[model samples]
Target: GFRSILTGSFSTPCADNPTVAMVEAGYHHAGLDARYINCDVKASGLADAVKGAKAMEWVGFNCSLPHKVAVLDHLDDIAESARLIGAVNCVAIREGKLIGHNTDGKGFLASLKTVTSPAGKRVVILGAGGAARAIAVELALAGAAHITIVNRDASKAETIAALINDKTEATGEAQAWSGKFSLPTGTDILINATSIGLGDPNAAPPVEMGSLTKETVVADVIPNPPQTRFLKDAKALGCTTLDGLGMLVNQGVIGVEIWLGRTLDSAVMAQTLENIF
Candidate 1:
């Protein structure tokens, strides 16, 4: 008789997004009921909506763009990662208490299993938006030797990187992605956190792919088509590339467990993935 619910600040458009689709898959796989609620209001209404969720006892919610950073102020408790990144991609409420979390970083950590933990490789992240901040905190927490953020606007990058460095006991820096970027000789990982390739084939990351080495791991957070132009270029340079699908899947893992108060079945999850894709 349980129903899976996904609420976000965005309206109808998000209902068709990959994240909510995955949650629906999980609910169907478990033979549970499911529903999508639109909290379509602006950021100011977030706290009240959260309070309403607590009052009605929502199992969990999938936080989305704009609200990812805004929802933090409404929660009863925020996870350290969320605090560091200033974003929360997921939230679960119990007994009128709200707990915030950032599953995007956790998903990236899982996505980088090919590398050793506390990945000591020199890493570069493109873009300093919410995604960059969250992933930066995650990489530092996982022990990346050094993290550098590059954005078109130096001030924006500096703001995100400084927040991450100041909050987490990790090494992180920010730089403007001018033509002068002298990419370190042995950079181990390159991450594209911006929506450079959401659905546009012409959109390329501002990075020089020729500088990438086979040893470098390239990852992009865009899952549509399973392969993005940026990932394709990185692959041409012989670097290992990761798509956004895994992160999409992991969002459900965090959302379902929190909502159901139980672990979901991996076998069913696999089947759901096959069906959705």
Candidate 2:
């Protein structure tokens, strides 16, 4: 008998993603038969793509962009972690069931754990996209006392807040973007989980820096330059800062671990990323 496990990553404009490079390197280093591919699927074509994955018996896929939330309608069931997060970055197929799981927040928690645990911390997250959604839910699930979600669209923020309040063990508050969002005086962890610094390294999230303290842990989600202005600002203020690379590596590692039922040395995958950037 011969068998080869198939898995891939899907998102619009994903053809340019370098994550597959590290994933393959990890496979070779671990002596595994599993393989990973990266492909593009526009928002409009996600359903058909999901159908294709089912037919091909793909172990799962790490879906990004518009598909993170949209992929929900086409799945069989949401795992408890992703069920509360209200988004799924990956789908693991098990015994014919398409189960949605969000490794985004789980990986983030892993990164954040090194600096500080979310438990008993007052956390604030900017943006209401899938990345923010996953991060917020995981933070709340980990026992963060209060989480204020601030976004331009308060409705989206409210929904994420409502999900956290109803499903997780934390108080959730939604704030409409009103002027520059100042760090709450009692805030312990603050994150810019938006696309502000994604492509434009010059851009910084519109957060008031005056209130940042050495005690407040800050993080950004953009990895290319790795040192976003927001993080530099935090660093200047003597605050502990986390670069997005930590989350990206953990996300890839967690996704590979979930689909393959094995652990991957994230350091091996990280080296592959370092050479590219």
Candidate 3:
């Protein structure tokens, strides 16, 4: 029997995880004996879960939702990017040491770069959660000129903005989210890093569609329904759009690379996602 290289996600709501299908497809496409699993782990069990995986000698796993920040305490070393972002979505075990890394924003960058680079662009990211933080940090690191964090929670929004301001060269600011939040004039990119469109596909974020210009690039973090209303609404206004699947696939490729040392063909992963969602 051949020992398969294993990877997985530690998620609270594991049932809805599509990364399993997306990642396993890459494994099969590359003809590798690898398995990607989705394990349901509660917040209380997270500590034990890490040790269990370490005991099992599994390559690494994704820490989803609440685990993104909490898993930090379990890591022996944290990547600089993840440290500044204050979250870790992926972790790699090397020589009995667990190192934390974040690929969420990296995935978004992979998707966004397909349309244009972040260098010197002004970006608006909705929400101040883990995804937004990761995306903001990566965008700032990539040399975006400015990033505005918008959220109903003004304090949370300010935290991310301040992180961007003090940590990176990018100018970061916070906008109070009220009514239909309008994009500032000449905004280069708009991203709905929130989960507004996740469970409810039709429920788009409260961004003012009229504010979007044809030159703006729109993106969403919701992958189950890749064509988020935000993206569709932006396209209607003649704006270029990037779907969540590209981000998810690209993020998965990075994880596989970190764990298995394989350069994955993201096309295969994308196609697999299409078949599922």
**What CA RMSD would you report for each candidate?**
2.9, 2.0, 1.3
lDDT of 2 at 30: 90
Clash tally, candidates in order: 0, 0, 0
Lowest-lDDT window of 10 residues in candidate 1? 4-13
lDDT of 1 at 75: 80
**Candidates by TM-score, descending order:** 3, 2, 1
Winning candidate number (TM-score): 3
Whole-model alpha-carbon lDDT for candidate 2: 0.84
Local accuracy of candidate 1 as per-residue lDDT tens digits, 43-116: 66667777776676566776675578777777889877777776787887666677888887777766777454
How much is the lDDT of residue 99 in candidate 3?
Answer: 95
Compose the digit string of candidate 3's lDDT tens values, residues 150-212: 999989999998999998999999998996967889899999988888856568989789888
lDDT of 2 by residue, 17-47 (tens): 8888888888889988877878888888888
For candidate 1, give the lDDT.
0.71
